[PDB]
Paper text:
Here, we reveal the extended and contracted atomic structures of an intact contractile-tailed phage (φCD508) that binds to and penetrates the protective S-layer of the Gram-positive human pathogen [name]. The virion can be divided into five distinct regions: the head, neck, tail, baseplate, and needle. Structures of purified φCD508 virions in both extended and contracted conformations were determined by single-particle EM of frozen-hydrated samples; the resolution ranged from 2.6 to 4.0 Å for the extended phage, and 2.9 to 4.2 Å for the contracted form.
At the base of the capsid sits a unique opening, centered on what would be a fivefold symmetry axis in a complete icosahedron; it is made up of 12 copies of portal protein gp45, forming an opening through which DNA is ejected from the capsid. Thus, there is a 5–12-fold symmetry mismatch between the capsid and the portal. (J) CryoEM density of C1 portal/capsid assembly showing the symmetry mismatch between the pentamer capsid vertex and the dodecameric portal. DNA density shown in yellow does not form interactions with any portal proteins.
Residue numbers in the entry:
A (entry chain K), B (entry chain L), C (entry chain A): 19 to 382, 389 to 469
The structure:
Amino acid sequence: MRMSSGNIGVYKLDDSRVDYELARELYQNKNANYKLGSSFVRPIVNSTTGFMGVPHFQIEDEEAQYILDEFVLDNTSKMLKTHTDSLKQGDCYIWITREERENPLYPDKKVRLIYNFISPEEVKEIILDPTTKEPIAYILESQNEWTDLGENKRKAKVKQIITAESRFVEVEGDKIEGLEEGETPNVWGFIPIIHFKNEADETLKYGQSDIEPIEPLLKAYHDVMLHALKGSKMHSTPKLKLKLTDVASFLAHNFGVEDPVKFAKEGGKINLDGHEILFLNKDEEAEFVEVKSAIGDAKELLKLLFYCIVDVSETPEFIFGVHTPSALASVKEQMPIMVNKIRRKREQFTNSWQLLARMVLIMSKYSSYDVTIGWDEVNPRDDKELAETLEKVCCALDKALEGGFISEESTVNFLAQYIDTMSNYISDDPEREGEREKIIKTKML
Amino acid sequence: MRMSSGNIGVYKLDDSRVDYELARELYQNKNANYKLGSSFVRPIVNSTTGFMGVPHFQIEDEEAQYILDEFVLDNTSKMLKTHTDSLKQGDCYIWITREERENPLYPDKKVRLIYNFISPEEVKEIILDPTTKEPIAYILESQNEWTDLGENKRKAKVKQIITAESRFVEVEGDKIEGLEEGETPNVWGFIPIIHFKNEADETLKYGQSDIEPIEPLLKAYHDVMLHALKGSKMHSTPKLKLKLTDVASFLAHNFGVEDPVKFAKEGGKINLDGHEILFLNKDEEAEFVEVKSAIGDAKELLKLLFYCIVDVSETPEFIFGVHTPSALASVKEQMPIMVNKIRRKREQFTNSWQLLARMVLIMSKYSSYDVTIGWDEVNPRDDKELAETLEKVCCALDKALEGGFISEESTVNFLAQYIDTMSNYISDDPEREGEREKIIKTKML
Amino acid sequence: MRMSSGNIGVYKLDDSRVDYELARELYQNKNANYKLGSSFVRPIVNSTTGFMGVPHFQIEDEEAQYILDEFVLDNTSKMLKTHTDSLKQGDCYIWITREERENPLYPDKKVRLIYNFISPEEVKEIILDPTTKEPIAYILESQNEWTDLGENKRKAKVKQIITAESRFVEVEGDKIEGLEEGETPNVWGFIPIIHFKNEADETLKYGQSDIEPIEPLLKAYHDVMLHALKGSKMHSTPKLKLKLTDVASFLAHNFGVEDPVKFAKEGGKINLDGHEILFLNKDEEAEFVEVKSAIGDAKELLKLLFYCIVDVSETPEFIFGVHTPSALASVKEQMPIMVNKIRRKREQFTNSWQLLARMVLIMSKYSSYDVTIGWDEVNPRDDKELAETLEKVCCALDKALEGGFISEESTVNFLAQYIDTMSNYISDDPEREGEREKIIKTKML
């Protein structure tokens, strides 16, 4: 709606968070208030995170490219889990750490960069620069309950302040060997934590889960489903109604129920087999008390709520094709809608991935530290069609020779793109296959 | 839902575990509280585990590649079983052991690496490093009840601590010949156990079964089915109602029931056939007491619960095409949904497979220990189309010769991928055929 | 479905068995409690065992390959029956024995390896190594009732211990000429028995039948069908109702039933031809007492149970296309589902087949004893398409000659694959046709 120019309050940033425990419960269908309704959460989040894939780090420096290739080779699955965590929870925090420990399971890697997840509950507070809004300190806090290599239980409340100039850590409880209390300097002068913020908003400090828009619809769907289930349980089975001359005599004679009041008080049950025949007198009557529909219009309301859920999440209908088998007729026809959604969604994380690649390069000189994020194919391209258009361009070239030698400039780029498309396996997330194939080719020659 | 920045509890890792016995019972349709509902568990789990196949270990060192080829040749089926176990139970544990025993059944393989399964119930406790969160000890425990080669029954409670520096085993009860009590050194400085964690989450210590999201839906489906079945058994067959002048005399004359009270008390049955004729008085009446529908709306509710189950598991609709025969048509059209699900699912295990391959290589010097995991094709490629695009690329090359000799770098990689696509049989799990074809070629030359 | 870390009992191996007699009765539709329900057992097991075919033993040693070719030539049908038995019963035991007896029916084969089945009931107990869980003794027991070549009946209770170091046999009854009583040495120091274990689980000593998951559904289907059939038999035929002024006089005049009580006591029947005309007085009435539906909703419940059975067994819908004729229209479209199921199923037996081939090779020096298990085509390939892509390979090669002489390496492997896929007849189980074609080529030259 509209409003006058005045009569509007001062802008204030929101520090509210996503209630990550509830989001995880909805994702796993565990919350009792959403069990019948939260069935839609998993397909939405998982289809969205599967179709967007993982970033493909691209940089023009050969050494930086090699470092990023090694990093993705190590942590492509962790990147995909970062995507699905950000979608489910709204916030996901990635901590890059460098460990020089020597252990015999990794004799080939003296120094390793670790892709550590900080659970969003651990981040008690983020201290932002009031002007530039970038973080200047992360207040992590966790309750570590663990067991010693002996038989002793252990507990410790660890809070650690992570800042660009140093990191402080103090534990309130049992000793932890790997963490040294007190302040220790931070080797690089930046915070090595990356905040992944799904559905980031300029008026919000933290991200938003993809479940948040649909959550009231899930609640309504659960309520309608539960009401329908209870109504059917109570009334779907018709009730036999016997209008008897003497109810007590009939019960005593036919079921041995001598005291029906006590029989009802104790919840007694009359056993029936189905193949019964009724011998009544003239005045008595037997009839079934039956409902035309114990559910009423709950089916239509659930269909409307399903439509609203699909609209809000913007899920293409083939994801929910069991509801609407028409969508399964042509997935390729609907795939542009998925491409549009994934295009919109990938931009919410590419800046974070550029920051992560920049920090990885710094934490391990290079002519450039900027990275461009490539991506997996949402709608896979036909390699045969690519070769067809390649040969068509080639035969178009080498004719009307006044055009100059930019034919080489065009064809080298086309060949590079063709190799990228061909070597990247459609059904395998990331581009580890292409990197390892290049490495094997370099080794074998 | 949202919440304020404050008023949030401290993060704590969850040590809860999947009820493995219940998970197996649901998988095998054995639990009486889920028999009519747990019919969906098997298609979900088995379609997911069969479409993802088994990993293809790739490494640039030829010795490491040969070792991994031998390992997959020996233990490819156990890896598919590991996938199935991780999906069904949430947790699967693989113990790699090296055995030098000489037995006549293996005259050649003097030394063997054994792919042993630790049942998830055996793992009494996992001791984690409080900082790095990696396991530093595994507390295994099992009750071994067995028969001696004579006639004697044997029972022994064995618990063994498996640590990176040594392994300790103590057995209470009868002697076990193959296990030596007390501590013995660990020849390898790392724990040789691999923890396969399905649906791993940063806030969880153990994996989640694929049955957990659908379990309440399975329970509701079972309840609705059982209620419908009981209602139909009670009321589907219509009941003949006779309004007689005198019931007792009618029963005595027509069925010889001289004492109807005792007849009902003992549960006597009146034998009848379909062909009958009723001779009644003018005042008497005979009628059938019948239900329009003994089930009511349970069919619609079961349809809704089936939709919820299919949505939660994200199973493509052709898996349950008997419910929806439209889904059976155009399975290739629905394959991208399966491809997406398998893409997302394979990343929960690839890191564990990298660890397993690394440990196998260390257990059996190599220039590298990093293994890249390939995979079976979900939507198999057409060999003829690969040949066509190979020809198109080839004729595109050898023209506009200013491009240089990088055409070798593209065509050799394409030929490698091409031979990989051919030698790997689509219908056969893993790549045993591709490895042994090369081995037979090397032998025969 | 979750549980806390503690409050879990110790792991114990389960030695329950599959009730093989009941499984065979269900397979043969012989159990009276499953006759109307067990109709689905045969198509499930037989489709699964027929589409998976038999193993193709591949080894790189020419002599070992020849030995395995002879073995499969002898025992391909027994191998397929082993698959069927493992699926039906859960357990199948194969005993490889070597006999040097001279008989005139086999003058060409002085020494033969016999593929003997041990019925799973014969195996009283399997003694396992408590640590490695490999069997160390098989306790076989059978009641041999037979006839002498004369007129005498014979009965003997034979139990034999089969161990790696020796085999013991004792007979409690009549003499058996072929079994020398007492202990005898084992020529090879391994047990010559192979245990085929369908649906093997780490927590189960024995295998599981494919009937076990569906058995409660079969029981429910039988119960619903039997209730429906009895209800229809009782009530489908409408009952003629005559409201008469005097029933006894009517019966006496129209049917000669002078004493209706004695007529009803003896179960007398009134003969009717269908073409009757009723002459009544004004006060009397005649009407048919008829049911709208004697079955009620049993049809819908049976459809639901059929869907559950198809889901549990994971049978592709074209196997039960009589229920759903839509499936039959697109069998080729559904073949990927069958391929997935069969690919998953084959891995449960391939280790046993590798062990069997290894034992066969040992029981008859070789450079290698490891065998790779090939398989029949589930979705058969088109030979013309294979030749087409071969031509595409050939024209792609011999161009851009810097690639080297690995064209030979690729093309020889593809020619071998083409010969394999061409000579192996699709409609004939196994590869005996290709083996004898090669043998005839060698003989005739």
